[PDB]
Structure 1
């Protein structure tokens, strides 16, 4: 089968790791201690075609480092995650897109905008705002909760579809 290396980026505490664990292990974690070793592999079927997802979680890597750059050289598609209750994480998204464009040395990198923690009450970012930013990038936007599992499969599977159209 094809193997898809998907890299999850975003500000601290937005839920990169819980999203990854929810996808792979079908559990929601209340806390996650990152390592240098957190890649996760899982076989899934997307649109009738079996494939392998290799999820690389960037949690805990420094904002600018050789390891983070190596991680995104290896990635074929990217999830840019913010949290819908943290406006600053949504404002940081352009920084992660600029970083991916730099490392991949391209303006057309498979990417999906992910608005996580959609179960929480104190929303500060509208779906319309996020859709408008995704639209400016020409990429899909998906709303998720690693806790209720809403949108989790959709976000990773849509990213695979994005790779499959490149």
Structure 2
């Protein structure tokens, strides 16, 4: 299968994005087990390739900046999530992408997710122009999302699935 990992600072919505993609709702009393994938999902890409996605989510250990080698290793895709209203979580994106790249050299596609767009724009602390510039300077892609807007979650996983489907 294809290992896809979620990274990003605490509380940005990593688990909620995963639950929306897998369950169309938040399951309130389930959390990932350390050292293993949270869930796998069979998908059919636009090109008709069938892919087994193996989705890794943290169990809260990102609060300590303590993601292990084995969490990162063998990843083919990575979603780097931040919260548009949380400036520190955006500033951390640089750290997270660097940490991924020192621990894993197999990542084919890195997608920055600017999450929580459901919140009033008066509370946003980052502009699209800054996100565009950061992703240009750091060789990654970006999308806007909200875990409460199913279309945005389908869009971000769709971009990831289509990139994974191109791997030979």
**Same fold, judged at TM 0.5 (above):** yes
1:136 & 1:160 partners in 2: Cα distance? 24
1:131 & 1:98 partners in 2: Cα distance? 18
2:118 counterpart residue number: 119
For residues 48-75 of structure 1, the C-alpha deviation after alignment (integer angstroms, 9 at most, x for no partner) is 322111110024124225xx22011032
Q: Which is worse superposed, 26-35 or 148-157?
A: 26-35
Q: Which is worse superposed, 93-102 or 128-137?
A: 128-137
Change (3 A) 1:138 1:99: same
Question: 3-state SS of the aligned residue for 2:96?
Answer: helix
1:26 counterpart residue number: 24
For residues 109-160 of structure 1, the C-alpha deviation after alignment (integer angstroms, 9 at most, x for no partner) is 4211110111111211112211211121222211111012242122122123
Change (3 A) 1:38 1:50: closer
TM-score by length of 1: 0.85
TM-score by length of 2: 0.84
Indicate conservation of the 8 Å contact 2:45/2:165, yes or no: no
Q: How does 1:96-107 map to 2 (within 5 A)?
A: 96-105=96-105
* Count of aligned residue pairs for this structure pair: 161
Q: Which is worse superposed, 25-34 or 11-20?
A: 25-34
Structure 2: gaps of 5 or more residues: none
Q: Which is worse superposed, 151-160 or 88-97?
A: 151-160
Aligned-pair CA distance for 1:25: 1.0
2:65 counterpart residue number: 63
Question: 3-state SS of the aligned residue for 2:119?
Answer: coil
Q: How does 1:132-151 map to 2 (within 5 A)?
A: 132-151=133-152
2:42 counterpart residue number: 43
RMSD: 2.2
2:89 counterpart residue number: 89
1:5 & 1:26 partners in 2: Cα distance? 21
